[PDB]
């Protein structure tokens, strides 16, 4: 067998059947004779390729396979890899390299020092020393991306390797099963359970790795048993809990002092599947108030090591959440009371308040909709206004890197064909990965894109104001016609200049048979 045939058999045997890619000459020997049981998803720029694959992997809860062109193509994707790193997304990034005979002279398209290019944004990065090693290296990449803590990996392959003979002993790779589905030993788990049972006023904080693990329902049981309020850890990449469950208390503010104040009076705070903590704004103060003990369960040694406070347990989130939820006592305390509905903001017949948009989406969208957020000034309101009952219902760029939601919404919709995806994207954010719209059109992936058009980088104008920073250039983005962009890439386009038009446009979009972009004029 050839390296080509052995590698595709390994991929198939390991559950991979889709290649997200943008092609190039160093990849042609890999992409030729493309197997009939595989699907190729083309995107027009590599940030878009990797964003689509990322949304696919996060929603599917399985690795996604990517194939890129050399250094330039890998490079174009590195902002996307920054997000994937922070979301623990299991991405297998392969890049075509020059033929081994031409690497030394640094022919055009040579990926120089290739394994160093994506660092520090990958778990493992490698170029094999020979063609026959390529299947083994691919095996390593699959497992490295897939073991807890999941994350992106990189493999560079010289184009002449594919046609070479494989090692027949590569067959041992095909059916390897590698597990990291582990939890704290029984003795220490009993100690933790007792501490949770003995707490007088526990709180729970959940992060994205809960949703990635589909540990959401177990965390609901845990919260119900402990009669504990539940917060989502700051800068949330995913939604780990039903947002109208009585225990839910919303998104934590991303500040040191704000979080210790919020946690004051809680004697034990159990954090599951989050860094401690993904702060953002400078908000100096105490990490915890006196009287609060924190215990973190994390899938990631790097998270456990850098927490500035608390104990930690490094384990699989699914396994730990299931064990805790089934072992804790049912507390006698009263169940927390649900948060009240948010206020309806006054809305005239002109430009839309973001609150209006989110209320309307919540009114009209299916109960199993999936939302993506890249409308950076409106996140707090979005989290208050969307009832998200189900797992997998929310994604936000985990490193704060714009250009994620537009392509990722396409990959999420590919992963979840029965669940309507609605991406709420600011006018600034929409440009970073605008060409991803074409993939939605070509493959008829029926994502709805809601462009929040306020003409500015609003979150940055806001922050300049908190700073009292004068004379800051580059904060306004006037003069973009998003309906024309949508037409450019073959996506149906609508405008919404007022609430009547927003409702009309959403109605049209929700019944459409293809992707739709709605440009919304916001305040």
- 401 near ligand TZD, judged by CB under 6 A: yes
Q: How many residues bind Ca ion (CB under 5 A)?
A: 7
Contacts of 333 (CB under 8 A, 6+ apart): 227
- Report how far residue 388's alpha carbon sits from residue 244's, in angstroms, rounded to the nearest whole number: 7
> Between residues 57 and 109, which has the closer beta carbon with respect to its own copies?
109
Question: Which one of the spans 111-119, 260-268, 270-278, 428-436 is the region binding ligand TZD (CB under 6 A)?
Answer: 428-436
Q: How far is the CB of 118 from Mg ion (least distance, A)?
A: 6
- Report how far residue 324's alpha carbon sits from residue 315's, in angstroms, rounded to the nearest whole number: 12
Among 21, 63, 392, 515, binds its own copies (CB under 8 A): 21
Q: How far is the CB of 334 from Mg ion (least distance, A)?
A: 53
> Between residues 364 and 475, which has the closer beta carbon with respect to ligand TZD?
475
Among 426, 439, 486, 521, binds ligand TZD (CB under 6 A): 426
> Between residues 249 and 419, which has the closer beta carbon with respect to Ca ion?
419
- 306 near its own copies, judged by CB under 8 A: yes
Residue nearest to ligand TZD (CB): 426
- 393 near ligand TZD, judged by CB under 6 A: no
Question: Which one of the spans 174-182, 363-371, 381-389, 426-434 is the region binding ligand TZD (CB under 6 A)?
Answer: 426-434
Among 2, 180, 261, 390, binds its own copies (CB under 8 A): 180
Token code pair at residue 180: 């990291």
Site string for Ca ion, 362-381 (x = CB under 5 A): -x------------------
Q: How many residues bind its own copies (CB under 8 A)?
A: 152
DSSP one-letter code for 478: -
Using DSSP, how many helices (H) and how many strands (E) does the chain show?
21, 18
Q: How far is the CB of 484 from ligand TZD (least distance, A)?
A: 18
- The per-residue DSSP string of 318-384 comes to HHHHHHHHHHS---SSPPPPPPPPPPPPP--SSSBPHHHHHHHHHHHS-TT-EEEEE-TTSHHHHHH
- 377 near ligand TZD, judged by CB under 6 A: yes
> Between residues 287 and 396, which has the closer beta carbon with respect to ligand TZD?
396
> Between residues 296 and 447, which has the closer beta carbon with respect to Ca ion?
447
- 455 near its own copies, judged by CB under 8 A: no
Binding positions for Ca(2+)? 427, 454, 456
- What percent helix, strand, coil does the chain show, rounded to 5? 40, 20, 40
**Which partner in its own copies, Mg ion, Ca ion, none is near 80 (CB below 5 to 8 A by kind)?**
its own copies
Residues 42-81 that bind ligand TZD (CB under 6 A): 69, 72-73, 76, 79
Q: How far is the CB of 440 from its own copies (least distance, A)?
A: 11
Q: How far is the CB of 91 from Mg ion (least distance, A)?
A: 16
CB 449 within 8 A of CB 516: yes
- Report how far residue 265's alpha carbon sits from residue 243's, in angstroms, rounded to the nearest whole number: 23
Contacts of 467 (CB under 8 A, 6+ apart): none
Q: How far is the CB of 8 from Mg ion (least distance, A)?
A: 29
Q: How far is CA 427 from CA 46, 375, 409, 439, in A?
A: 21, 8, 16, 20
| Residues 249, 251, 253, 256, Cα dihedral to 10° | 80
- 64 near Ca ion, judged by CB under 5 A: no
Among 202, 275, 407, 411, binds its own copies (CB under 8 A): 275
Q: In what order do the strands lie in the sheet with 492-496?
A: 394-396, 370-374, 421-426, 448-453, 516-521, 492-496
CB 283 within 8 A of CB 294: no
**Which partner in Mg ion, its own copies, Ca ion, none is near 426 (CB below 5 to 8 A by kind)?**
Ca ion
* 285 backbone φψ class: left, alpha, beta (φ>0; ψ -120 to 50): left
Token code pair at residue 100: 């081994």
Q: Which own/partner contact pairs does 499-505 have at CB distance under 8 Å and 24+ positions apart?
A: 499/347, 499/349, 499/352, 499/356, 499/360, 500/349, 502/352, 502/356, 502/357, 502/360, 503/360, 503/364
* Sites of contact with Mg ion (CB under 5 A): 119
* The 3-state secondary structure of 143-182, one letter per residue: HHHHCCCCCCEEEEEEHHHCCCECCHHHHHHCCCCCCCCC
- 14 near ligand TZD, judged by CB under 6 A: no
Site string for Ca ion, 395-434 (x = CB under 5 A): --------------------x----------xxx------
Q: Dihedral of CA 482/67/207/281: which sign?
A: negative
> Between residues 76 and 296, which has the closer beta carbon with respect to ligand TZD?
76
The residues facing 451 across adjacent strands are: 425, 519
> Between residues 91 and 268, which has the closer beta carbon with respect to Mg ion?
91
- 64 near its own copies, judged by CB under 8 A: no
- 402 near ligand TZD, judged by CB under 6 A: yes
- 407 near ligand TZD, judged by CB under 6 A: no
Angle between helices 134-146 and 3-13 in degrees, nearest 10? 20
Count of all residues that appear for the chain in the document? 523
Binding positions? 116-117, 119, 427, 454, 456
Q: How many CB atoms lie within 10 A of CB 350?
A: 11
For ligand TZD, the binding residues (CB under 6 A) are 22-25, 69, 72-73, 76, 79, 375-378, 400-403, 426-429, 432, 454, 456-460
Q: Which spans of this chain sit near Ca ion (rule: CB under 5 A)?
A: 363, 415, 426-428, 454, 458
């Amino acid at each position: 067998a050839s390296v080509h045939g052995t590698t595709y058999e390994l991929l198939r045997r390991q559950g991979i059947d889709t290649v997200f890619g943008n092609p190039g000459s160093n990849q042609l020997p890999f992409l030729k004779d493309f197997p009939e049981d595989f699907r190729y998803i083309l995107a027009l720029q590599e940030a878009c390729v990797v964003g689509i694959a990322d949304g696919y992997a996060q929603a599917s809860r399985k690795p996604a396979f990517i194939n890129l062109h050399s250094a330039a193509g890998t490079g174009n994707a590195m902002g996307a890899l920054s997000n994937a790193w922070n979301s623990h997304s299991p991405l297998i990034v392969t890049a075509g390299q020059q033929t081994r005979a031409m690497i030394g002279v640094e022919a055009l398209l040579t990926n120089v020092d290739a394994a160093n290019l994506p660092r520090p944004l990958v778990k493992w990065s490698y170029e094999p020393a020979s063609a026959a090693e390529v299947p083994h290296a691919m095996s390593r990449a699959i497992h490295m991306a897939s073991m807890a803590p999941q994350g992106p990996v990189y493999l560079s392959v010289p184009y002449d390797d594919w046609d070479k003979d494989a090692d027949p002993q590569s067959h041992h790779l095909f059916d390897r099963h590698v597990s990291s589905s582990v939890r704290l030993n029984d003795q220490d788990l009993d100690i933790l359970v007792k501490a949770l049972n003995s707490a007088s006023n526990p709180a729970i904080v959940l992060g994205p790795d809960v949703d990635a693990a589909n540990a959401n329902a177990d965390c609901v049981m845990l919260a119900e048993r402990l009669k504990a309020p539940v917060w989502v850890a700051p800068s949330a990449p995913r939604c780990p809990f039903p947002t109208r469950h009585p225990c839910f208390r919303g998104l934590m503010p991303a500040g040191i002092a704000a979080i210790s104040q919020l946690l004051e009076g809680h004697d034990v705070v159990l954090v599951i599947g989050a860094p401690v903590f993904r702060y953002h704004q400078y908000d100096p103060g105490q990490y915890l108030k006196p009287g609060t003990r924190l215990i973190s369960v994390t899938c990631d040694p790097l998270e456990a090591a850098r927490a500035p406070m608390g104990d930690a347990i490094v384990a699989d989130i699914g396994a730990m959440a299931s064990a805790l939820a089934n072992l804790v006592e049912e507390s006698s305390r009263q169940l927390p009371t649900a948060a009240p509905e948010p206020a309806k903001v006054d809305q005239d017949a002109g430009r839309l308040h973001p609150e209006t948009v989110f209320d309307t989406l919540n009114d009209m969208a299916p109960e199993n909709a999936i939302y993506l957020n890249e409308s950076t000034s409106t996140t707090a309101q979005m989290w208050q206004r969307l009832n998200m009952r189900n797992p997998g219902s929310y994604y936000f760029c985990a490193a704060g890197g714009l250009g994620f939601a537009l392509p990722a919404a396409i990959g999420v919709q590919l992963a979840e064909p029965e669940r309507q995806v609605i991406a709420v994207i600011g006018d600034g954010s929409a440009n970073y990965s605008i060409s991803a719209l074409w993939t939605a059109a070509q493959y008829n992936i029926p994502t709805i894109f809601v462009i929040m058009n306020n003409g500015t980088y609003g979150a940055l104008r806001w922050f300049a104001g908190v700073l009292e920073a004068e004379n800051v250039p580059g904060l306004d983005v006037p003069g973009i016609d998003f309906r024309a962009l949508a037409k450019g890439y073959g996506v149906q386009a609508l405008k919404a200049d007022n609430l009547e038009q927003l409702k009309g446009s959403l109605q049209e979009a929700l019944s459409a048979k293809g992707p739709v972009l709605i440009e919304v004029s916001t305040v």
